[PDB]
Amino acid sequence: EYRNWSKPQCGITGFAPFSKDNSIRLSAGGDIWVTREPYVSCDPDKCYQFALGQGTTLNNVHSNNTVRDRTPYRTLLMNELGVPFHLGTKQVCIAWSSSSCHDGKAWLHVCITGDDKNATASFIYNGRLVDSVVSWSKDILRTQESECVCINGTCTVVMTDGSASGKADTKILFIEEGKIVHTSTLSGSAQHVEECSCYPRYPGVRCVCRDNWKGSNRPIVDINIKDHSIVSSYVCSGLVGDTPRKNDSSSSSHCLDPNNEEGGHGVKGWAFDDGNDVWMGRTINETSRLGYETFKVIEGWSNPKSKLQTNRQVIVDRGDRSGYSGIFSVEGKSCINRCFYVELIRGRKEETEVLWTSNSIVVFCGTSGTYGTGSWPDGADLNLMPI
Amino acid sequence: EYRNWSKPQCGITGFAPFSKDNSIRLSAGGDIWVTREPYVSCDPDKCYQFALGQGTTLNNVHSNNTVRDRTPYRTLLMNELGVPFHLGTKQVCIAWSSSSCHDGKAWLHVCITGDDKNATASFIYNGRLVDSVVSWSKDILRTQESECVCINGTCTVVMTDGSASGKADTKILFIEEGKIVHTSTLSGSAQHVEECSCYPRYPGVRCVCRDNWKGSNRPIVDINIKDHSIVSSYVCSGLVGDTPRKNDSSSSSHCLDPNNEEGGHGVKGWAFDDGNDVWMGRTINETSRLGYETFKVIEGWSNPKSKLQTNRQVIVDRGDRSGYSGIFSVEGKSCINRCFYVELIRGRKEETEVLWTSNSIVVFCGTSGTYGTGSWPDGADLNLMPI
């Protein structure tokens, strides 16, 4: 009944289209939730999409000025993958930060809400409020914004608390049926760790995070699900994935330390490893969240100083808006497949012809077959939609 | 299969956020039922929210003047906890008063409707109309407006009939698979008993009610689920929980009798006991239903003249509107947890910029871990919503 992710990793030559929600296009006619920060997670049967909704629909007076991220009204919305966030959507907890697991028996939700100084994480398992934690650093407590990973019933959640540009306390929480059985403080070479995309690299969990303080390469957190031992490093490829980042001609990585290049802010993203090569995805524009491309860097998990791509794909076009992206793993018949989702953000603070901010999602999965080209933007026309 | 609530009570140091429906905020855009008097109840798998809907949506011509409580059109609406009362909501009985149990096998609904003089209470079990009762006092027959409690298949419902300010006949009905097997008249020191919040204090049921006639402390009804013997008293803590109430410095309780202080009206609320201490919740404003705070009074279940709070929480801010609140118990892995819900009322008779009255719900559950601070109001802006 429990899920242990024991199978090997599927052979990946690229990613094929899997899903699209068309949320903003449907919001022009119809009642659709205003969301942001989505992700995808699958129980052993099918896949579900999650988002953080702002407590209102888009054709709503309350949709005005929804660019904030921490309000008492944001909740965690869950549907099946494909069903748009209509008014029948079940909102499963109060949260302005969230993460979700399925251990093979029941769903686990980690939900953060509250004052920026105090902040509480409620751990909800099987429809019960099983546990709760308070901020340790008395700052904005926050978590992965994507799926967490369970192996043998022990699920792991990475939670950060502290300054965005400075030393912050990051912890890894080991949860069993909603109860927190252990908590390990982060240790290693990664200085700033946020919004991690974790995947089961049996026998453990590997997370690729964002460095929001001093690096444009991504941190790596290796969690031993068993000994509860944490290792930290940086993604070693010379083609770094955070945005803002420097141009490919002049970008660098350290494989241990932040590169100290255009590391002021960042975006949530993903990466995983195929032998020595690294499969990664990033925005096409190096400074704005415009476009989205995935590719493979040869000897990129093992060598800084490698800038050799292969199997490049353009999931969203250079001039079309993207945002947070993340990884989730799907148990196949003989191996474990890796899929990713891209959040396509539309609205205020970058397009001033509307008063709202919302997102759509586009989902791709790895394939051992062949694939073509394309581009799957959001597609909404905001010049005609209601303000 | 039956539910017997045999486990101990969970260790409670406070309550953590569990759910929020954002009904009024979504009602501005979208079709949402106009409701009031909600509650929450859980079958052994998940939790459901119930409400008494006025037979109309909010963006409706029939939404005008919905402040009445007894109309031929109010029905009992049931969704999963989290799903807002959209137009796909199943309305499970005709009722302007209601209560609901789950005995581990099927749902029980007690639904009161009809004329104020001759009223009818239908008892519906497993989708059948199993039983029915008429008013005994030929007055407004009414019930708990929250969940009832079943132990070994025998469920218990507290029903009052008679004058709101005077001697009213209160009875406790013992139901088995929808059939009323016994009926005990209330006996003890509690004079007026209404809108009880009951919880399984194995081996029996303990209900904390409202005194709408002569007290601002809450009555207590101890039902022996087995011998069908009823005991009545009052909540003994010096910090009384009803509203209207006197200020903390000048409040009193009797442990046996109404205190005769600001006892004219009241509000439905809850309280339970942790050893000698009492965990309770009340509105922050002592006269209006504004705000909501929960805390613990030390030796408050055994000693009057005790005004020693601890573990205070502010669930709804002092400047925001609240209403009915109630308790419901959730069976955990090793103990029984206590949760409460608060009804956030918005609209006419207190905010004259709209013609309707509705409510939103916020749900908290007890926790043995730590928690922070916050405030979770309804958030609707009625200056911009349709009248």
């Epitope: 921490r70 920026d116 100084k117 700052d139 904005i140 965005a164 603070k349 | -």
Partner: antibody, heavy 123, light 107 residues
Amino acid sequence: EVQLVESGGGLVQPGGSLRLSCAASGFSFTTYEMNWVRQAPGKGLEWVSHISSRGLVIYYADSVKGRFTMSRDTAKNSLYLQMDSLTVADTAVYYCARHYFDRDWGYSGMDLWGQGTTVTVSS
Amino acid sequence: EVVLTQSPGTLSLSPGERATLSCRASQSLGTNYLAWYQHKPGQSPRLLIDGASTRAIGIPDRFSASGSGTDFTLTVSRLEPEDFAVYYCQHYGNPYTFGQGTKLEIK
């Protein structure tokens, strides 16, 4: 409607103390960064101090540093400026303003402003 | 340590022309923590531009802004009678600093 109302502006002889208060309606200080900004008569805007939503005073202007104390009450939603040893250069119109720190994008910018209170140090 | 010198002081023009205001910065700064405010006298400051390129909520379409590093520019493309005021450029990242302003007066 959100509003900020500053109060406490008055004549102060040099060497004195005045406490300015800014009462906020429609939002909570537990999620917003609050600022004191002053305009001396005939000069431009000057950023006096800044406090986080987590309650830390992030910055005090060099002139005001050591003489002014900025605090907040998150129960009454009030912001306070205790000005000590007021000099004649501190005569100005004072303004409480509000901005935001977003987890994703970062600091935003002062979008809500008060009416203003004038503090004149004289003679 | 970053001093924001608004370049034109007391620019004067007539309704319906294009006005270009400039904020030059001593040292280079993150081009997303600079903002532009309007302070009509007797009224509280109002935020026009944020992140050096983003129009605020409610601001007319006349105002636009641009810039990078040490250079910043604002332009009201077609002036209006009530768009005559003082304009400040602010750096709300570390180090915090305002500008001295630019006065627009009807000729």
